Design a protein around this ligand. Structure first.
Ligand SMILES: Nc1nc2c(ncn2[C@@H]2O[C@H](COP(=O)(O)OP(=O)(O)OP(=O)(O)O)[C@@H](O)[C@H]2O)c(=O)[nH]1
Ligand SMILES: Cc1cn([C@H]2C[C@H](O)[C@@H](COP(=O)(O)OP(=O)(O)OP(=O)(O)O)O2)c(=O)[nH]c1=O
Ligand SMILES: Cc1cn([C@H]2C[C@H](O)[C@@H](COP(=O)(O)OP(=O)(O)OP(=O)(O)O)O2)c(=O)[nH]c1=O
Ligand SMILES: Cc1cn([C@H]2C[C@H](O)[C@@H](COP(=O)(O)OP(=O)(O)OP(=O)(O)O)O2)c(=O)[nH]c1=O
Ligand SMILES: [Mg+2]
Ligand SMILES: [Mg+2]
Ligand SMILES: [Mg+2]
Lengths: 480, 480, 480, 479
């Protein structure tokens, strides 16, 4: 084996070490070719054809870039080629656990199909990685290139999912900075974002990307509270605030697009309807369901966006209901968007409260004459938590900086030191309401319920409120 | 009414409601599940794009061109009816593509059904009819002022040429002849399909080359040529046109005919042939078809996409074992091995009927070198690629009409000699790639000896690595 | 005939012959010799671009917007005459810029001629008048159907606002929306920004811009307060906030770059020193100074970045002091950046106070031993007002929107209806301090004065404060 | 410490302190005031870029290549000293360019000072010497481990070639280093790589060569008894494409008919101003635009500024020069008449160039003309278009290697690649312009021009049947 070059449209020509190639050329990794990065987003942004596979290559490459840069700049860190490869592998493999349509699977389907279990794509990535290593005899190949499987497989898993006092076993405290590259638990500034910003923008057809190359050139390792951490140059602080602003922009415009979400919702509904009747064969010929394939990696290996088409193309009558929903997607007969609002002030909505919300909307009594009367089951309520990655916290408060005059001395920089034009809050909730009845009269009624409900709950006035519900909006004194 | 879509290539494009109705059908949406470049994605990880988004682009550019001509030359009497028909033809010219695009019509069908002659273009017309009839489009066409009898004919003619002189078209008369040059230009191949795929494929492939269609549109005009109204280019654009075809040739050499992309397409085709007996696709009336016969029924063909690849890969039926095994080898990157490339010298051209014999010929070569292993015809694959400027031996620029700034209504011809001596002296050639199914080191060495000997025996060109792969053979040929 | 130009930002643009005639004059061609970003080029080597190409872009976008509105809403009665007037205003709104753009109106003139109030906008109107009269344009305007009396008034009003109830004479109230295109006095959303965002980013090497093409597609004219105004679709509100965020980012990183500014400051200083000795010939053979060329357009026509080189290459001993400063720029022996701070709370710094500030810093009395003692004249204090274009106000409160369900009904959208992640203030001040003595000991001293002076005035703690002034920062409890 | 700078083409690049010191001098900064494409800006409004930023790019790419080779092949013994010398050469290879770049060496000097043979390359070496000596760089070079005697020689040799192994700056084992900045063997060098990307970015054409790909597949192998840079066999197509792109750029942009004529007008103005402009050089001595190349202190002050000095002048002696520049501003340019090429064997010699306007005026078109034109009314511009090696194919002078034997250099012939490639690699374009711009003069000039083409058996101009319908029928060959 020798090193391979591959042309990526985002990064150009990148080199891949033979070990990485061996990892890539497996059913477990190749599976990522058949999972869309943005799931239902493609049905809104026709440029967004990209899959997890190419994103993974980018993440692995950037992980390598960062660790190489640090090693060249600071030999004293004692970064070894062994270290570099482990970081690249973690980067490559951090997306291994994603399921059909990416966040839809993790975010919508599994929570509804298997409420008892707690599952995340991160956990899946670690399990898949284990399966990949074992199924394809990788450990011998790792030792051939100087890796120590016991320590290094631990290290790689830890980089992806965190710890399985210094809580890490894969590397010691002096190599702490290595854990900040692939998946940064401290502040979320990592190479995964850097790739998806550039990649998604290229495919979506939008600007606003983050300059990671610049950032890498000004990154350094310094001691902070007896730990070696990656620090940014002071002047980059504005760029970091911009980075998270960009993330928020991308989520508003693309990843949480009202219609993209509704399509994901419909797909999830179809999957629930099909869950009983689809069988996926796993280890030992044993059969699993869409919802239980996460228990067996051999079965999960076979679980991709394909299932969408399996259902769509099915002829079995048991799958009729599921198939019908997907057909409605093709005809673009989607559930209709009614509107969006937000909680005012201190109110926050708990996940346990989510199931009640359609009931609440149907319970509203708008003082308007209606031809039709709608029920809880006719409404969909989608609650979206928008933040800078750290719930209420400002991630920049958890970044360490250094200045030109003392490169080894780490410092903190507060928001007030940067700008008054920055956000005063770093978390919020969006509530979108849709109606399953698409007819004109139903839709009119749904708007009356929706706006009334917003008023009843003292939520923010929807932007089109005066148009969609002119009779309702005047009642609320606050609104005008 | 109008829908706006963000396309990463063209930006925000408007779509007329009629076009939206056509798009929102199973027949059109199917194009989301067919890769533009098929196996190319397995070589260029940026090339995740599907036929769907390319189709939008072609339809939009078709509209751009016809609009531009109408603004510039009102006397042409171009109607909104005309504009819509051209846009529909642009949208729908890719409807007939099958799994992995050119693989299907280029490799699979010719081998699976040799008696039949089938092209994606014919498929597009049949699919279009099925789309119209299945979704009640004709009433909607009339609603927007189209005349289905004439206009459906016109649209089909734009895609496939005459359905049968002097004037062979029924959809529009001679005065509107220029309209037939927009979507699919049979005269010289200069059309909006190429313009979109150049820009789109380069964006996704990661290569900066493309053709400036926007410039070209600004200098395009309609003039009378031989009693026909034709689109003419400004004289100064002649160099850019030669460059356009050069770009096309570059793209084919580097990407579309990439040695490994082709071999992957070949393996997939082989797997499909092995699965053809056992896969069933349900068409009209519940009747079952095979991969190779789904082209007979559009309802079945509607369900025939890249999905089939995964159906086979994930199958457990033992009858599909052989097919499934081939696809598994693809995932492990255990591909048939590239041996080399050569070209015919001088007079000789290779006929399609000769294609079967070629592996036999290579196995029949007797290299004068000691070999551990002896290879057979069945161990070789020979892939013959015709590279040209779209018109076999002819120069497409000889079939372009120009005009000059001093007499915009007077059409002229421009010969190659009037432009440059740095242009090609031929416009067609053949590439011959040889692969070996036995991948082991000793087999591979042997295959190289057969190959190079064969080239010498047939007076083909010396392979570029010939002195390295077959140092004992190359000296025998004095020419080399 | 129409002329076509290839602009790297917009591609191939058509220009009406009238516009070409305006462009092909000394008054317009002068813009080739004025850098868009002045001293910025000395920090961003990509930023070679001049006012000339930016002007073409603004003119073209002005045309795009007005064309789009006309096509969408014929009832507006927009005439080709209207379209040309808007394009001319767009082309000519940058005519009044002087050497190094904002340096000239922002730094040089205020210091050279404090009694006078002068702006590039005023200059643009005067230059335009001179251009028209010097080159016999009025006859050509009439040839293409313009009415010079009304239309020249209209064009000047678009650039500078009312030349003084409907306050405009160039067009009536029904055409009020036309005044929002080139230079939008109501909220600053205009085509000038749209071009410079894209152009500067292309040249600077920053991937950010605003998608004006999207915005244009969703723009409409509606009646607001008995005036016809351009309204944006409700869903674009987030993009508008993003637009102003991008503007702020660009000012922070590029237009107010600490070094770019100091270079502009040095150039200004050199100009002041040369002002007495340079002569520029204006109308009647008559001589003016850099600072008085603004009084005569014939002289101002000859006033460009050239003067920089005139001084640099001079041999006259009277120009020695000026020439020496420019030489220091070439050797990169610049005044040294000491640091940046901001006023706390609601403290604001008045323009009249600016001269006193260097004195205040020299007066500070840091409790540290210093080898050297610095004086007011050794300090430069640069006060930068950063806002969203409307001082304290939020421009989005002065935008009108419409919704999908009632396109003719204008609405307002408050910040609270959009997001809590938006800024709570829309204006702030940055204070940069530099030292004219560049030696190590002087620089160390300057840092102590600076930080002490921040503490004394309860300004924000400089980002590197603990490093540059470790003995000073502990005294201030607030800081830590 | 290293300086980081943002270049729109390459992104954020690091510069070694020594390189910064070289850059921060009047001799280098002067390149900010010289347009990369001269008169091209007056056709492509994107092309505002100057030699300065291009020079940074070339220096950076020179560094990239040498770094890549060193990492891949430690056995080459490439030292940091070597890397810096290559970067400096890259930075400084454009130092010798004059007002409006190629206009100055290509048009002005040849006419102003025919006896002298001058090239920007020679200027770059002289400027470099002046830069080093004026700014005390040698001490700074030794501070960073360079050996000025050997290394300054090496740098000059990289720019201009030699001043048996003919190089003194480095020995035969380091021969590959001379192929990076300015490749005399086949023209494949980092200068091109930067200007392709840079010019395309500014021009607004999406054309280009992937140098990053190429660097990844470049290797050093022994060829003859010389260590040379070799390309992977599979890159051969890309190399042919590279030169095709170069040709495309020259046709569409660098030799644009109008960009050339503007350059020609500016040159004419400079000739008219040459007597009356004075530039102060060493010892307070005065030079002319045409003699400033003799003194680097004067040449340092010679930039695109001179264009504006003339334009803004009020001295009556500069009236004629000033008037020409004014015509440029009004867009009252000399008019393009047409373009043709020589047929078959024929080539046009440089000595023949002065006669050409006379020949065109001597043509006797059989058409009635209101006005009669003279030699002085015509401009004839002969452009040699080639792949950088006159008649030769540069790819015949490239060495390749194959994946199965990376240390074994090979040759690859055109026939082994494709029959769609060019059969010739050099040609000549002949553009004719007229100084009389009125409609009737133009019409006349077209008749002279086309007649002249026919008389000389040159190729039929593309618009010939339109501009000279009465002339084209006479020539049977044409039709
Ligand atoms: N007029 C003009 N054109 C410019 C300018 N900058 C770039 N151009 C481009 O230069 C091209 C060629 O210049 P032209 O003025 O057309 O010269 P020409 O074609 O020989 O003369 P025309 O017959 O008048 O077109 C034009 O097509 C423009 O696209 C400018 O400042 N003024
Ligand atoms: C041939 C070629 C490939 N590529 C891309 C496609 C691949 O993603 C990547 C590497 O492709 P190749 O350079 O074709 O690599 P290869 O492994 O096929 O050739 P070999 O093994 O025989 O060295 O580069 C280009 O971008 N341009 C080109 O001209
Ligand atoms: C919202 C949004 C969409 N897009 C893209 C995605 C889609 O391809 C296209 C349409 O997006 P939208 O404008 O959101 O279209 P919509 O149908 O959701 O809105 P409406 O309620 O008016 O019908 O624009 C952007 O590029 N930027 C954006 O901010
Ligand atoms: C601040 C900034 C600069 N730049 C560009 C401008 C310059 O070409 C290059 C370096 O700019 P800076 O990073 O500002 O470098 P500096 O020398 O001004 O900072 P310091 O001296 O304090 O280390 O990067 C960006 O591209 N983005 C940015 O956000
Ligand atoms: Mg919609
Ligand atoms: Mg022209
Ligand atoms: Mg600095």
């Amino acid at each position: 084996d020798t090193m391979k070059v591959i042309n990526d449209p985002i990064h150009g020509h990148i080199e891949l070490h033979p070990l990485l190639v061996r990892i890539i050329d497996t059913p477990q990794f190749q599976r990522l070719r058949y999972i869309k990065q943005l799931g239902g987003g493609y049905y809104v942004f026709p440029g967004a054809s990209h899959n997890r596979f190419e994103h993974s290559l980018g993440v692995g490459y950037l992980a390598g870039c960062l660790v190489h840069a640090l090693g060249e700049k600071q030999p004293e860190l004692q970064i070894s080629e062994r270290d570099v490869l482990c970081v690249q592998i973690a980067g490559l493999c951090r997306n291994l656990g994603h399921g059909p349509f990416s966040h839809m699977f993790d975010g919508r389907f599994i929570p509804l199909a298997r409420p008892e279990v707690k599952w995340t794509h991160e956990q899946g990535s670690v399990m898949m990685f284990e399966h990949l290593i074992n199924s394809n005899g990788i450990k011998p190949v790792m030792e051939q290139y100087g890796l120590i499987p016991e320590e290094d497989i631990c290290f790689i898993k830890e980089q992806i999912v965190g710890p399985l006092l210094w809580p890490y076993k894969g590397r010691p405290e002096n190599k702490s900075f290595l854990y900040e590259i692939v998946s940064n638990k401290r502040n979320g500034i990592d190479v995964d974002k850097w790739d998806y910003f550039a990649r998604d923008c290229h495919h979506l057809g939008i600007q606003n990307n983050f300059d990671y190359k610049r950032f890498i050139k000004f990154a350094r390792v310094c001691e902070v509270d007896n730990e070696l951490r990656i620090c940014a140059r002071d002047k980059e602080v504005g760029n970091l605030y911009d980075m998270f602003h960009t993330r928020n922009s991308l989520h508003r415009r693309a990843y949480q697009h009202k219609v993209g979400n509704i399509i994901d919702t419909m797909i999830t509904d179809a999957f629930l309807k099909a869950d009983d009747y689809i069988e996926i064969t796993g280890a030992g010929g044993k059969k699993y369901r869409i919802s239980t394939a996460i228990d067996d990696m051999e079965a999960y290996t076979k679980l991709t966006d394909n299932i969408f088409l399996e259902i769509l193309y099915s002829t079995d009558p048991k799958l009729k209901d599921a198939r019908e929903i997907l057909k409605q997607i093709e005809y673009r007969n989607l559930f209709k968007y009614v509107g969006e609002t937000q909680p005012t002030g201190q109110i926050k909505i708990k996940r346990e409260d989510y199931e009640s919300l359609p009931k609440e909307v149907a319970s509203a009594k708008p003082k308007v004459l209606l031809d039709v009367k709608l029920k809880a089951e006719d409404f969909i309520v989608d609650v979206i938590n928008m933040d800078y990655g750290m719930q209420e916290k400002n991630p920049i408060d958890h970044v360490s900086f250094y200045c030109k005059t003392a490169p080894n001395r780490a410092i903190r920089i507060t928001k007030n030191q940067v700008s008054q034009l920055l956000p005063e809050k770093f978390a919020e909730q969006l509530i979108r309401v849709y109606c399953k009845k698409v007819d004109r009269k139903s839709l009119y009624a749904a708007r009356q319920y929706f706006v009334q409900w917003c008023a009843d709950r003292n939520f923010t006035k929807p932007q089109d409120g005066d148009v969609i519900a002119p009779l309702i909006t005047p009642q609320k004194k606050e609104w005008n």
